[PDB]
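Hi there. Long-time user, first ticket. I'm pasting a complex I've been working with (about 1018 residues overall). I'd like to know whether the download I got is complete or cut off, because the file seemed smaller than I expected. Thanks.
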Amino acid sequence: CAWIPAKPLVQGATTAQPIPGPVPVANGSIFQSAQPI
Amino acid sequence: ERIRDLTSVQGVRENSLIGYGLVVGLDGTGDQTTQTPFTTQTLNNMLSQLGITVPTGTNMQLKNVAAVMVTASYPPFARQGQTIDVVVSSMGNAKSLRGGTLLMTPLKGVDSQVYALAQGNILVGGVNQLNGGRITNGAIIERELPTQFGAGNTINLQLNDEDFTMAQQITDAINRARGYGSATALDARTVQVRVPSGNSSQVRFLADIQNMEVNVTPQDAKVVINSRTGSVVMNREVTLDSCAVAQGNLSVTGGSLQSVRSSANLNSVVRALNALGATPMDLMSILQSMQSAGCLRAKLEII
Amino acid sequence: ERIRDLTSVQGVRENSLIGYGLVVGLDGTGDQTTQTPFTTQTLNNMLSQLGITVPTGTNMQLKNVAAVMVTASYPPFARQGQTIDVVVSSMGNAKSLRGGTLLMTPLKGVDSQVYALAQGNILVGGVNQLNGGRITNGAIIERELPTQFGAGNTINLQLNDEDFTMAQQITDAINRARGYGSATALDARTVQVRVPSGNSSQVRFLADIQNMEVNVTPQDAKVVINSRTGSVVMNREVTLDSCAVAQGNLSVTGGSLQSVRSSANLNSVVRALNALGATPMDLMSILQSMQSAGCLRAKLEII
Amino acid sequence: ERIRDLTSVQGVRENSLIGYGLVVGLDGTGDQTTQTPFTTQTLNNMLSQLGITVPTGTNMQLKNVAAVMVTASYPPFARQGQTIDVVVSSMGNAKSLRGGTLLMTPLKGVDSQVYALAQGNILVGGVNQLNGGRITNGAIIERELPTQFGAGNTINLQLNDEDFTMAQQITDAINRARGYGSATALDARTVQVRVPSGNSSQVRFLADIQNMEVNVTPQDAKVVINSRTGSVVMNREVTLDSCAVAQGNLSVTGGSLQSVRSSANLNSVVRALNALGATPMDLMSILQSMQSAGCLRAKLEII
Amino acid sequence: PTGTNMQLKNVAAVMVTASYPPFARQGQTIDVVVSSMGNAKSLRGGTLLMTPLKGVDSQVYALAQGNILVGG
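Hi, the file is complete. Here it is re-exported in full:
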C-alpha cells in the first residue's frame, strides 16, 4: 500500500542553478545590464 | 580649443564609486552610537579583523568615531596606483567631521567590485558645512577597466547640446582641416570621425581635433527661471513682442497697464522689462504670463 | 621639471597601512574605559604579554590611556629599517592626546600583514584638533614589496589628468629629446616609453625624463563651485555669452535685469560678473542659471 | 656632509623597546590603586621578590606609586654596558610624575626578549605635561644584535625620499669621487655601492661616502595643508595659473571675484595669494578649489 | 540586526528627476533635480548617493550621484 509508486504533487526538479552572467562589453562603463525584457 | 569644450569622445567617460567607512579623531563630535548601531558594529568588525574580539554583550558609547559614506569618480583610462579625490559625508546624528581621518575604505562600483581604496585626512571649511568634507588624492585606484579605444577606424564625438547646425559645423570644420571624408554626421548629437587603425595614430588624431576652433552658431531663445533660488537668465536670442502688462502694485512711472515695446535684441528686451520696475519674483510671473499670451518669443524653462 | 609634475611612473606607487594602538601619558584626558571596553581589554592583553595577569573580575578605571587608530603610507621601494610618518587618531570618548606616547603598534596592509611598527611621541597643535596628531619618523618599515621595475623594456607614464593633447605633447617631447621611437601614446592618460634592459639604465632614463620641460596646452574651461565652503574658482579658459541676469535684491547700479556682455578672456568675465554686485553665494546660483541657459561656456563642477 | 643627510645605510637601523615599571617618590600624585589593580599587584610582586609577603586579603591604598610604561630606542650596533634615554608615561589615573624615580624595568623587544634595563630619576618640565617624562642614560643595554655588516662586497644606501634624479645624482657623485663602478642605482630609492671585503675597509669607505656633498635637484611641487594645526606650507616649485577666485566675505580691495595672475616662482605665488587677503583657514579652501579647477600646479597633500 | 532603533539626523530620502535628451549616448552627463520626500528640514550641503533613474518602462537609463547646490 505504502510501497505503490506515486507521482508527487510537486513534480520535476525542486532547485535551479544560476546562469553565469553575460560577458561585459568593452565600453568604458562599469554599469552593465543584462538583456532587458 | 572649442571642440574639446563642445563635445566628448566616445568611450572616454567617468564612472561613480561608492563605499562605507569610519572617520576617527573627532573632538567629541562623532556619532552617538546609541541611535546608530552600525557604527559600533563596524568598529567591532574592524577590531576583530585586527585581532581584538570585544565581547558581544558590552555597552560601547563612543564620541570620536563617525560612520561615513565615501563617494568618488573613476576617471577615464584609470590605472592602478593613481590617486583621486573623494567626498566624505556623515550618515547619522554626527555633529562635525572637522579634524577627522578616514580609515581604509573600499570604493565599490555599480557591479559591487572594489575599484579604489580610500584613506586620508578630511578638509572641512569651518555658514560652512560640518558633516561633509573632501580628501584630495584620498583614494588609490586598484582596478582597471578594459576599453575598445584604438580598435576600429571610427570614433564618435558626442555634442553636449543637441543641434543639427552645430553638428554640421563641427563636421565641416573637421572636413576643412583634415581631408574630405574625415567626419560625418549621424544625428543632431553625434559626429562620426574616421581615424587610422592603431593607438598612437588615434591619439594624434584626437589631439589635433580637440583643440580645433569652431564658431558657435546661434542657439534657441531660452529664458531660464529658478524659483527656488529666485533668478532669471535670458540668453542673447530672446526677443519681445509689443503688449500690455499689469500686475499688483506696479504702475506707469500712473495707470496699472504698462506698454511693452517690440524688442529685437537683448538690450532692447532688458530695457523694456526694466521700464516695468518689476522685482525678479514679479518678473517670473510677468514672463510666464507673457509666454502664455505670446509676447515672449522664447522657450521658458523652469529649473 | 614638468614631466615629474604631470605624470607618475608605473609601479612607483604608495600603499596605505593601518593599525591599532594605545596612547599613554595623558593628563587625565584619556578614555573613560567604562564606555570603551576595548581600551582596558587591550591594556590587559599588553600586560599579560609583558608578564602581568590582572584577574578577570576587576574594575579598571583609567584616565591616562586612550585607544587610538594609526594610519601610515607605505612609500615606493620601501626598505626595512626606514622610518615613515604616522597619524594617530582617537577612537572613543577621549578628550585630548596632547602629550601622549604611542606604544608598539603593528601597521597592517590590506592583506592583513605587518609592514611597519609604530612607536613614538605625538605632536598635537594645541581651534586646534586635540584628538588627532602626527609622529614624524614614527614607524619603522619591516617588510618589503617585490616589484617588476628593471624587468622588460617598457615603462608607462600615467598622466594625472586625462588629455589627448597633453599625452601627445609628452610623447613628442620625449621623442624630440631621446630619439625617434622612444615614447608612444596608448590613450589619453598613458604614454609608453621604451627603456634599455636593466636597473641602472632605466633609472638613468627616468632621471633624464622626469626633469624634462613640457609646455602645458590649454585645458577645458571649468568652473568649480564648493557650496560647503562657499567658494568659486574659474580657470583661464572660461568665457561668457551676452545675456540678462536677475536675482533677488540685485539691481542695476535701477532695474532688476542686468546685462552681461560677451566676454572672451578671464579678465572680461571677472569684470562682467563683478558688475553684477553679487555675493559668492548669489554668484553660485547665478552661474548655475547661466549654465542652464547657455551663457556660461564652461563645465560647471560642484565639489 | 649631504649624503649622510639624504640616505641611510642598510643594516644600520634603530629598534624599539618597551617595558613596564613602577615610579615611586611622588608627592601624593600617584595612582589611586583602587581603579588600577595592576599597580598594587606588581608592587606586591616586587615585595615578594625582595622577601616580603603581604597577605592576599589586605587593603593597600598607596599615593606615591604610579604604574608606568617605559619606551626606548635600541641604537645601531648597540653594545652591552652602553646607556640610552627612556621615556616614562603614566598608564592610569595618576596626577603627576614630577619627582619620581623609575625602579628596575626590563625593556623587551618585539620578540619579547630583554635588551635593556631601565632605572633612574625622571625629569618633568613642570601648560607642561605632568604624566610624561624623560630619563637621559636611563637604561643600560644588556643584549647585542648580530649583524651582517662587514660581510660581502655590497652595501645599499637607502634614500629618505624616492627620486630617480636624486638616486642618479648620488650614484654619479660616488662614481666621480671613488672610481668608475663604485656605485650603481637599483631603483628610485636604493643605490648599491661596492666596498672591499672586511670591517675596517668598509668603515673607511662609508666614512668617505657619508660626508660627500651632493647638489639637490628640484623636487616635485607640493603644498602641505594641516587642518588640525591650521598651517599651509608651499615649497619653491609651486606655480600658479591665472583664474578667478570668490569666497565668503572676501572682495577686491569691490567685487567678490578676484583675479589671480599666472605665477612662475614662489615669490609671485605668495604675492598673488596675499593679494586675496585670505585667512589661512580660508586659504585652505581656496587652495583645494584651485587644485580642483587646475590653477594650482602642485600636489596638494593634507597631513 | 532587524530589531534595532536607528535615529539618524544626516540622511534624507529624496526623489530625483531628470530629462533624457534627444539622441542621448552612454557616458554623457545630464542635470538632475533632488527633492525631499518627508519631514526633512534642509538639503543645503548634502550629497546624492548612487541613484538609478528609471523611465516610464521602469528601465534604468541613467545613474545619478553628486553634490547638491541649494540657494540658501
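A couple of notes from our side: Strands of chain E lie at 14-18, 32-36, 47-54, 60-67. The first strand of chain E starts at residue 14 and ends at 18.
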